[PDB]
Amino acid sequence: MDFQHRPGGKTGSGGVASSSESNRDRRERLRQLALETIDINKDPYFMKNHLGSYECKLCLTLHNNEGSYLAHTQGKKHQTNLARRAAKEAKEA
C-alpha cells in the first residue's frame, strides 16, 4: 500500500449523511442565505411566520421557500403604489 498516497480519511468519522439529512441541511443553509441577502438588502417587508414560511407584508402574500419570496420582488408593484401612501405621508413631492 501507498500509505502516503491513498485517499485519506480520519478515524471515528461517522461518514457522509443520507439524502434526507443532507437536503434538510440544504434547506437550512438556503434559509440562512436568503435571510442574510434580505438583511443586506435591508428589506423591511420580509416576514417569517409561526411555521417557517415567508410573507411579503405590504403585499400580504405567502411564500413556501426562499426563492418564492425573492422572486416576488418584481410583479404587482405595490412597491411603488406606496407613492399614494407617501402622498398621504406628505401632500407634496
Partner: protein, 103 residues
C-alpha cells in the same frame, strides 16, 4: 434537461453575490438539481450583470452583418467583438435579420 426556472435563478444571483466567481461547486451545493457546470453556464450565459440582454442597436447590427461574413460560423469568436456577447443573442440577431432581409 436544464430548465432553469426563476426560483433557482434568483438563488443563483444570491449565491454569486455571496461566494464569488471561481467557486461553483460551493454554490451548486444548494440547488438540488444543478451541477457546477450548469451554474457556470447560466451565470455567464444569462444572469451576468454585464449582459445587455435587450436594446438591439443599429451600430452593432451593421457591425455583425459584415462581421459574420468575415468568419461565417463561429458565434463565439465574434461574440466578444460585438459585445452583445451572449453568443446566441448574436445568433438571434443574425437569424432575425436574415428573416427580415428575406420576408
Amino acid at each position: 434537461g436544464g430548465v432553469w426556472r426563476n426560483t433557482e435563478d434568483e438563488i443563483l444571483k444570491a449565491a454569486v453575490m455571496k461566494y464569488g466567481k471561481n467557486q461553483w461547486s460551493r454554490i451548486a451545493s444548494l440547488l438540488h438539481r444543478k451541477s457546477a457546470k450548469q451554474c457556470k453556464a447560466r451565470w455567464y450565459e444569462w444572469l451576468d450583470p454585464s449582459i445587455k440582454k435587450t436594446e438591439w442597436s443599429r451600430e452593432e447590427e451593421e457591425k455583425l452583418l459584415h462581421l459574420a461574413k468575415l468568419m461565417p460560423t463561429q458565434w463565439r469568436t465574434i461574440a466578444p467583438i460585438i459585445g452583445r456577447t451572449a453568443a446566441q443573442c448574436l445568433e438571434h440577431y443574425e437569424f432575425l435579420l436574415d428573416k427580415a432581409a428575406q420576408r
